[PDB]
UniProtKB/Swiss-Prot annotation:
Name this protein carries in UniProt: Bromodomain adjacent to zinc finger domain protein 2B
Localization terms from the record: Nucleus
Domain of life where this protein originates: Eukaryota
Residues of the full protein shown: 2054 to 2166 of 2168
Reported function: Regulatory subunit of the ATP-dependent BRF-1 and BRF-5 ISWI chromatin remodeling complexes, which form ordered nucleosome arrays on chromatin and facilitate access to DNA during DNA-templated processes such as DNA replication, transcription, and repair. Both complexes regulate the spacing of nucleosomes along the chromatin and have the ability to slide mononucleosomes to the center of a DNA template. The BRF-1 ISWI chromatin remodeling complex has a lower ATP hydrolysis rate than the BRF-5 ISWI chromatin remodeling complex.
Tissue/organ expression: Expressed at varying levels in several tissues, whereas a smaller transcript was expressed specifically in testis.
UniProt domain Bromo: residue ranges: 9-113
Subunit structure: Component of the BRF-1 ISWI chromatin remodeling complex, at least composed of SMARCA1 and BAZ2B, which regulates the spacing of histone octamers on the DNA template to facilitate access to DNA. Within the BRF-1 ISWI chromatin remodeling complex interacts with SMARCA1; the interaction is direct. Component of the BRF-5 ISWI chromatin remodeling complex, at least composed of SMARCA5/SNF2H and BAZ2B, which regulates the spacing of histone octamers on the DNA template to facilitate access to DNA.
Family: Belongs to the WAL family.
Organism: Homo sapiens (Human)
Length: 115
């Protein structure tokens, strides 16, 4: 509250660390469905159904240009990628499986780096 602050958790390396995590996700072999934005002209249903499209390239641009105010808004966009993937893709598809694997991979790096 006013003039009453919890101790300062050091956030000065968060940008660098989110960038390392993102690099690791970019280079994972199962990242291929997620590297670029889904082509809304060429994928029937996607535009109407997926209200907030997100992909790794779009996160990288946002990260590079100061558009994440803190590490939680970064994690929200990463999870949005996988939540979108589960909305549109069957669990038993190559893309569906890719998204489960990547979400697992992310959440471990997230815990190991910050928790």
């Amino acid at each position: 509250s006013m003039s009453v602050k919890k101790p300062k958790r050091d956030d000065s390396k968060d940008l660098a660390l989110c960038s390392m995590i993102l690099t690791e996700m970019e280079t994972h072999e199962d990242a291929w469905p997620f590297l670029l934005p889904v082509n809304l002209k060429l994928v029937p249903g996607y535009k109407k159904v997926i209200k907030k499209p997100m992909d790794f390239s779009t996160i990288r641009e946002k990260l590079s240009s100061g558009q994440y105010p803190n590490l939680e808004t970064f994690a929200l966009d990463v999870r949005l990628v996988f939540d979108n993937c589960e909305t549109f893709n069957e669990d038993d598809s190559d893309i569906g499986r890719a998204g489960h694997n990547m979400r697992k991979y992310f959440e471990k790096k997230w815990t190991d780096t910050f928790k």
